[model samples]
Target chain A: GEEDALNIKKAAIALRGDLALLKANFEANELFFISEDVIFKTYMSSPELLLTYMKINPLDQNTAEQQCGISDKVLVLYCEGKLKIEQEKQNIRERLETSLKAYQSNIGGTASLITASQTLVESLKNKNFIKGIRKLMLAHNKVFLNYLEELDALERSLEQSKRQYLQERQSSKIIVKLEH
Target chain B: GEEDALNIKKAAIALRGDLALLKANFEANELFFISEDVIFKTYMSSPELLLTYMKINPLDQNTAEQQCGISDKVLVLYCEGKLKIEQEKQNIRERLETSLKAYQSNIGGTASLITASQTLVESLKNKNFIKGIRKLMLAHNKVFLNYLEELDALERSLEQSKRQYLQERQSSKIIVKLEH
Candidate 1:
């Protein structure tokens, strides 16, 4: 009993550590090293590259007309040019994170379900005692998911955000390739 | 085009193994383990160790004192002490995973940008279909990046949480690096 307890404790402990690491690593890049160059435009850090247009200055309407060819009204347009860039950028970020969370949840959930499901399946395989117990665990794992459902909700929220962002900014350049 | 499509496909598939690991492991640790030290008094585990001072009656107190000792106070604390010895392990896991994601996003974004840019640049180098598809793609890549920007923001938020957690709870000792 002690050994069983220790092993379970060890596994449980290890898992916690695993999660802490996942949560800690901050880079957007880390999400893809496992899969190669598979994710979307991560290069636009804080929209620095794509939305530089948003970094426009009007230079005062009267001051601008005297100094340069650009008009105050045009400057306003200039600002929105980049504002659109940023808006699209933000929309994409929320969406991607949303979809990503969900996508990851599915795989993880399935794995967890299978891993946790083993006890019951093995019980039946051995045709051992407490046959009913094993069945319950297996069924329970599926029904309750012994897995994180709220996580799934979070993932869905992420995906939905991505879609909605696109719908809202339909003409923007950040087209999410949801082909995968 | 096929090659380009394939790259996009891979980028999208990452939610499979990488991200899943990060969330669940932490969940498990949250579920298990408390320190032996925290369960006692004067940093002890025994009730006797706790009852070691003088107050009522000059020397000691009664059974009620044991239940409610003034000198021998009971201070029960809970640490996922595992957090100290373990956050690093998860940190490593997360770093490896997050870095992977970041790298993946960057590579995908850059490649698509280059490919699209080159196609447009070359096609439009001389005669073109009025609007350069290559340039359009390059521009499309820019727009696609809007989503990546979205991804980064979400990624950053998650990262901030991790960093704050690490900063506040300064124990989480280093575990063996997983990515290396």
Candidate 2:
């Protein structure tokens, strides 16, 4: 019985260290997210100038047959496609923002759950309950770990997509150069 | 001298037809350009919400291994590409507007040149002068024809590119459905 108690103490110690690390990581991650906002917004709005810059160089070719001319039909299609994309993007953004807020709200509750689990382990007293408590704590840790893993996967996916987006945006500038 | 005068008269009639057609086409084309503005602006502002939408759906699945997940990553890339395309469309619109104006400005000057050429033919007198005027009229018509051909070529190129863009954008939307 004394041996089992000692093992329980060991397990609790390890859990305490894990929880501290998770807390530190969670705070750091939140800070990192905050820092990203400004840059993200800047990147988001950066393309606004493209329309302005497009005006800088006047199409000076007199004869409509010159290579410099942009086709009226082509421009119509481009504008049409662009409008569709923008409309879709707007719808998705609103939906995304709402969902993100809802998801973020859950963070506090989950974090508190972690803290409660820790406290439960720290106050363990019934020696007869040692094995059962350990099993329950492990289950609790598993749930936390699973959720964190989910978050990690989602962020990775999001980042991958964003990076792809950034790449495409950068390359799209080539279209202008080609048109020129 | 008599033959030269006849040639100048012939050139004047041809130039008259060409100018009339150009003016008619210019107005018709102007209408086309005008129709695009509202739709273009709407499309231009369309992708504004995509990144925001991208943020809404968080993949909460553990391990990121689920195939059912919205590689929503694909959707994001799709949205991003669409935005870039929109930015480019905006740039082209502005550029097209400027060039169209520049091109339209020259139409008056060049059309006046044709009118002046016609007037010159009407006032022809000396045999030697008639010959020279006839040559000049031919040269002027050649310039106008060459210019029109150039405009045609340019518009064709622009149309080709725009259609390609339209097709790509349409395909991109499909990627979103598949991602979902």
Local accuracy of candidate 1 as per-residue lDDT tens digits, B77-125: 0111112213323543553454345444443443344344334333333
- TM-scores, one per candidate: 0.19, 0.22
Best by DockQ: 1
i-RMSD values for every candidate model: 35.5, 45.7
Candidate 2 residue-wise lDDT, A10-117, digit = tens:
656665565465345445434544553443343222233222223342233352224334455445333433333344345435544543454344444444444444
Point out where model 1 deviates above 4 Å: A1-3, A16-69, A72-75, A78-81, A87-91, A94-180, B1-180
> Per-residue lDDT tens digits of candidate 1, residues A36-120?
2333333234333322433353345563345444444534433443444345456556644653464354434333433433333
Local accuracy of candidate 2 as per-residue lDDT tens digits, B77-104: 3444344444444644554455355445
Q: How much is B31 displaced in model 1, in angstroms?
A: 46
